[PDB]
């Protein structure tokens, strides 16, 4: 009767604190990830693999974006990161592979200055150097947006048609072994 | 352009 | 009773070895905030969160000084970190913020010159940047702080009189979203 | 009757989850150690520590060969680390200490120029910076041990005869307190 | 100079 309960009592309390690890780890993992792909320049480089499957989810609606980790313009700048729409959004839906810039909350926001007015410069690389999409924009000073962040993320901006999606769908040399890369250059000019 | 206006994701 | 008994002792050594893998994951937590604070230029940038829970437990004796990250002089430079005591020390005991300057005992320290003669400012920003407090200090060659390295760290020096609490228990710009933050130079001269 | 059994399985099943979480735990110190030594202005330092213990097994040939940890040519440059033998190979068994240079796999292999074809100069530390060993190589642009890695490392390729055994055996200032250190410098010429 | 492969 007490012999049952005592090691029923342990199982519990054992499986809890064996829980309350998992948990803390899960978490120590996405972590040491994000710290993997940063960069404290202002130049950021995404990888999308498995573009074909997560092509897919995109336009069978089931996955619509995806955000890429997080990038600082310095050691101790503003901290930034990506989202994409491998079926387009907005004026952009279904037609073109839609891509917007993301200011979000950072360690040292209270010591920079706001709204982020930085050009940035986005790139759809080609994989044979020869002919990389480029575009570009200057942040509205007056968009909420830039302006210092008060949730996590602001709401995202950027290029609804960035690219053409038929101009992956075919023969091209963006997609190369199921995998496209995405580059992002934020002018650092009076920082 | 000169500076193409970001537009907000929607 | 022999089932009973195996079963007791199965969970015994097994609730151990949780203890252990509980260990192992805060020893592996503490090293990926260290990596992730740490710089190799000789500039850092300490962010005290919780200031006031902080400043509390210093007045009260409960925690009087707390240690930074660490931080180098280049990728296999010098090992160093910051102590701050938030009610004083020495000579500033109650009514000052005394920080400190520490030299650790590196990785590399066998290719390094010794004693460690580098110029070393310290600041305390001001969030609304209009006035830094700030004091730096050259190293007395002849004490033991500067030489090679026998422990984990050598002996603290800096400033006890950095700043007066007053100057932060009252409406001030130091003080912002309940954190702090303490800036360290170090002068690269001759390295 | 049952209750006894109802037991025995959890805390195997406990047992078997706490298992399987600490190789989890041990792939994630990996990754962190990894992370923890990689550079990218392609100049690397490699302590070897326990010298004598890993020259003896060098000798014993027990152990002949050692790899280091990875580091790069730029924040997405080539993947490359080092392979010593302590106790020499081809030209060089146990006469010299043979040195390697490694390509490994890397994330962005597919927007890098192919064959590697970077200067690579090796260095054996004197700890008294009197006259460190160096000797320095072209790649062969017809080798395959720098063409686009296919596998997860190329054929190593570097110096056989980088340093006599001799040099170290005795009264040296390469090894000190038990450890030599290996210095890597990829010019970064047309990158 | 030139490299050689590790044998």
Same mark, same amino acid.
């Given at each position: ?5 005592? %090691? ?19 978490? %120590? ?11 404290? =320049? ?20 089931? #996955? /619509?974006? #995806? ?5 600082? !313009? ?7 990161? %990506? ?11 279904? !037609?073109? %592979? ?29 994989? +044979? ?24 993320? +602001? #709401?995202?901006?950027?290029? /609804? ?10 023969? +091209?040399?963006?997609?190369? =072994?199921?995998? #496209? ?11 | ?10």
């Amino acid at each position: 009767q007490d012999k049952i309960e005592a %090691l029923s009592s342990k199982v519990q309390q054992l499986e809890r604190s064996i829980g309350l690890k998992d948990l803390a780890m899960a978490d %120590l993992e996405q972590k040491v990830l994000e710290m993997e792909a940063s960069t404290y =320049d202002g130049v950021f480089i995404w990888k999308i693999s498995d573009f074909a499957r997560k092509r897919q989810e995109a336009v069978a609606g089931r #996955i /619509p974006a #995806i955000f890429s980790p997080a990038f600082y !313009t310095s050691r101790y700048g503003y901290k930034m990161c %990506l989202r994409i729409y491998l079926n387009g959004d907005g004026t952009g839906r279904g !037609t073109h %592979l839609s891509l917007f810039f993301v200011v979000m909350k950072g360690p040292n926001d209270a010591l920079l200055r706001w709204p982020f007015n930085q050009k940035v410069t986005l790139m759809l690389l080609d994989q +044979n150097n020869r002919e990389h999409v480029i575009d570009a924009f200057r942040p509205d000073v007056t968009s909420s947006s830039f302006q210092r962040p008060v949730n996590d993320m +602001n #709401i995202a901006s950027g290029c /609804p048609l960035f690219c053409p999606v038929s101009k992956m769908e075919a023969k +091209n040399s963006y997609v190369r =072994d199921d995998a #496209i890369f995405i580059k992002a250059i934020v002018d650092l000019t009076g920082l | 352009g000169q500076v193409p206006f970001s537009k907000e994701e929607c």
